[PDB]
Amino acid sequence: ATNDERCKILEQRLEQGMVFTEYERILKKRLVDGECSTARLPENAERNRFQDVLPYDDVRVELVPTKENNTGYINASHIKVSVSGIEWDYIATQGPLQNTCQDFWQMVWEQGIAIIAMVTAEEEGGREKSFRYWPRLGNTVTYGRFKITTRFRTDSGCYATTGLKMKHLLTGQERTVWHLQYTDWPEHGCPEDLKGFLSYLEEIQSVRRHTNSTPNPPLLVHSSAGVGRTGVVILSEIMIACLEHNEVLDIPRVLDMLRQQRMMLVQTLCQYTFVYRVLIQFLKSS
């Protein structure tokens, strides 16, 4: 029940408004070896949603080079953290563009991805935040050598689960990909329903566990920019796992480690304070 001491500390820090000082001291990106030269190539300009939100060279997801994409470039970062003995493996990526759908599915295939955690809407405020890279039911699409079929979509209130089949058109191999989309989460803000977000995290945790039981692949997390709401998901799941290991909690240490793998994770104070609220409620129900 040492979680009780953690929950008081967290509630007090939030209640007294000491969260901000902690958050604003965390650097947004690497100080050194922060080169994003491949991402900055003129040839890759159309592949970035924002020319300043970029993967670092040494952790970018490298696609096998193709005719259409010689550098095999996608705006996506490997995120590998070890926190309290747990080795976490994610890929964090931006929302696909019309012209990066083949790249996105090539990454899904090559990296062995079984679960997509989508935490953006397709459209918000009249703007595209993610291209519709998977088919709409009523049910198949082809991007280069990958055929994607939507089997079903089931709504769980705050999020929806879509069963996808992905087929390699040159080998005939097929794989199931589970698409878990949180549907009401404004960009730069927080989920509307805190408990709904916890149930979304619970479903990601469950499906990862059970698909692993049947080299485990990274979880693919994406938003629009691939840093804000993506960062909330990753930092929340890591910190929740920390709650069982007695070791002293150090959220800004963890977020700093994460931003060493992909810049700008967790864009706003409300997103960071939301992670505190998530942990408090998780501990309040333990």
Author numbering: 878 to 1015, 1019 to 1094, 1100 to 1171
From the paper:
To further investigate the working mechanism of the phosphatase domain of PTPN21, we determined structures of PTPPTPN21 C1108S in complex with a phosphate ion as well as PTPPTPN21 C1108S in complex with a Src pY530 peptide. In the 2.0-Å PTPPTPN21 C1108S structure with a phosphate ion in the active site, the electron density of the phosphate ion and two nearby water molecules is well defined. The phosphate group is 3.3 Å from the hydroxyl group of S1108, and the oxygen atoms of the phosphate group hydrogen bond to main chain amides in the P loop. The scissile oxygen forms two hydrogen bonds with two water molecules, one of which is the “catalytic water” (WA1). The water molecules themselves are coordinated by Q1152 and Q1156 in the Q loop as well as E1067 in the WPE loop. The carboxyl group of E1067 is close to the scissile oxygen with a distance of 2.7 Å. Compared to the PTPPTP1B-pY complex, water molecule 2 (WA2) occupies the position of the tyrosine moiety, and Q1152 is in a downward conformation due to the absence of tyrosine. It is likely that WA2 and E1067 as well as WA1 serve to stabilize the phosphocysteine intermediate after P─O bond breakage, and what we captured in Fig. 3B is a product-complex conformation. The invariant R1114 residue is held in place by electrostatic interactions with the inorganic phosphate and E1001. In addition, R1114 forms a hydrogen bond with the backbone carbonyl group of W1065, which helps to maintain the WPD loop in the closed conformation. Close examination of the electron density revealed that C1155-C1070 in the open structure formed a disulfide bond, while C1155 and C1070 in the WPE closed structure are free with a distance around 3.9 Å.
PTPN21 belongs to the four-point-one, ezrin, radixin, moesin (FERM) domain–containing protein tyrosine phosphatases (PTP) and plays important roles in cytoskeleton-associated cellular processes like cell adhesion, motility, and cargo transport. Because of the presence of a WPE loop instead of a WPD loop in the phosphatase domain, it is often considered to lack phosphatase activity. However, many of PTPN21’s biological functions require its catalytic activity. Combined with biochemical analysis, we have found that PTPN21 PTP is weakly active and is autoinhibited by association with its FERM domain.
